Amino acid sequence: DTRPRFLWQLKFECHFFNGTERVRLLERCIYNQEESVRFDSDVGEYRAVTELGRPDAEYWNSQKDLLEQRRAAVDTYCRHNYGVGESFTVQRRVEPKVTVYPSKHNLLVCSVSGFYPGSIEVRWFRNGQEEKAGVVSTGLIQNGDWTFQTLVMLETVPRSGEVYTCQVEHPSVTSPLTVEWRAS
Amino acid sequence: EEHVIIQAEFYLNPDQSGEFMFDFDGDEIFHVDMAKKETVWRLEEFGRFASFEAQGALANIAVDKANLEIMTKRSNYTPITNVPPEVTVLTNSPVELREPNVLICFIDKFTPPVVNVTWLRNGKPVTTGVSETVFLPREDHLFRKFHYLPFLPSTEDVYDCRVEHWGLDEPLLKHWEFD
């Protein structure tokens, strides 16, 4: 099929800072790869991102009652849904499954998989000596099923007997998870 | 501390397709299957703590449809640029032989959201146990999508996430194999 396509998008976004102390609501309308109108809770009304969205902004901002309910959506919609789901979204705590294995003898990788949230802290140690030279991380990978994974690689392989230690500090555990790797 | 909750909907023409879902820091909470008028929770545990009526999302798609047809005539029927997708094939965890895992096909940075995703095992399509998400939103207004093939890792099988998008010329095949 070679017919032209036309796409329309609509997003409502709630931003939480320090629990529910500061809440920012961002509603966006996207037509064909380009945002055209947006609502910002800080601004408190619709702003035309482009000239395509200009008629929408002058139209939606002219409805008083729906703007008040959209400003108040920090409480009735953002704060409410935060309390509804914080027991399984914010307070969700899934322990990382940490394992180590050497690729091919270098680039020692520490697999931090199946954890939540994504605020991970991976540090490499050489018998207590925190090695920061050869550390390379692939990044924070999102699996789409409320989990995360991350591979952190340490370039410098040691001599025999130098026990490298991958320490993982995650909000799900108070005592950091340490998985040690031995040498030749 | 920073947390984001997103409710994302879209409507597409002339395929006449729609969507409605909820997002938390880039992870989906629930979506509604308008054909069955049922609320589907991304994880089954989420239904025991909260409830959403799928009936209310019908009126949102009916507004998304009428919005798209107004924007089409306004832009002088300017077609969307068929941006080809970047496709990554991941796994849920480090893989081991004869130990269940989940192949993940991360289809990223594409528009419009029409993709013919097909899991191919040694060249033939597979639908046994195949799961998928909905078109997940993005900051750059492109789309993400996850397709899951619960599979038993082995060295005798190879897998392809054949992705067909109108921004390509031939089907996009991203390979995966063990070791």
């Epitope: 790869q33 380009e34 | 640029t81 941006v83 080809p84 970047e86």
Partner: antibody, heavy 117, light 107 residues
């Protein structure tokens, strides 16, 4: 982060052989393709060729029979060559990055530029 | 060979003013256009690709657009580092052809 760096000799005597090298960091060439562009001093840009992540190379018809593009994924560097030099080859030589193996993936990140006169 | 005609060759404007750079092709390019900026130092940076998709590390004052066969790059307000050279680029099919270019000058 993603960076591209062009290096090459600046002295180009007439009717000689030219070679330019582009070095990239922050990504892999097995997943991205490298374009080549040049710019005469004080004038516009001209696309020369491109090599994709799979290895397919597409040169320019006007400058074909002279251009040559190669790669080395392990060394993460790109190469350009232009035989039979002349006075209009005086320009700045650049490289850029594009994803995948198809022409509809746009180029994203540029280098700084090497000079020949 | 698709021929790109970048409408302005040189533009002079002060800071905080709206400017538009129009690029037109001789054929149908299916919206595959990339916009570029070249600062007087000589470095080149992408602003918009696919003719409407802003790049990640770009200020929100750069907008891409398409209307039939006429493409554009719009700067809503001009800062001090915006005065540079700009080149459009079509990539729908080989050979890739740039426009002649536009030089942005501080009036």
């Amino acid at each position: 982060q993603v960076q591209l760096k062009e290096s090459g000799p600046g002295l180009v005597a007439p009717s000689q052989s030219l070679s330019i090298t582009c070095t990239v960091s922050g990504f892999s060439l097995t997943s991205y393709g490298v374009h080549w562009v040049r710019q005469p001093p004080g004038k516009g840009l001209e696309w020369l060729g491109v090599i994709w992540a799979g290895g397919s190379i597409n040169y320019n018809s006007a400058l074909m029979s002279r251009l040559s593009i190669s790669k080395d994924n392990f060394k993460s560097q790109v190469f350009l060559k232009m035989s039979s030099l002349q006075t209009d080859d005086t320009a700045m030589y650049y490289c850029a990055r594009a994803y995948g193996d198809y022409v509809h993936y746009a180029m994203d990140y540029w280098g700084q530029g090497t000079s020949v006169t | 060979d698709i021929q790109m005609t970048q409408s302005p060759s040189s533009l002079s404007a002060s800071l905080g003013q709206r400017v538009s750079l129009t690029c037109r092709a001789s054929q149908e390019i299916s919206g595959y256009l990339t916009w570029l900026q070249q600062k007087p130092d000589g470095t080149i940076k992408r602003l918009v690709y696919a003719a409407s998709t802003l790049d990640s590390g770009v200020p929100k004052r750069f907008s891409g657009s398409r209307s039939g066969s006429d493409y554009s790059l719009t700067i809503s307000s001009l800062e001090s580092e915006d005065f540079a050279d700009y080149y459009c680029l079509q990539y729908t099919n080989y050979p890739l052809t740039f426009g002649a270019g536009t030089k942005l000058e501080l009036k």
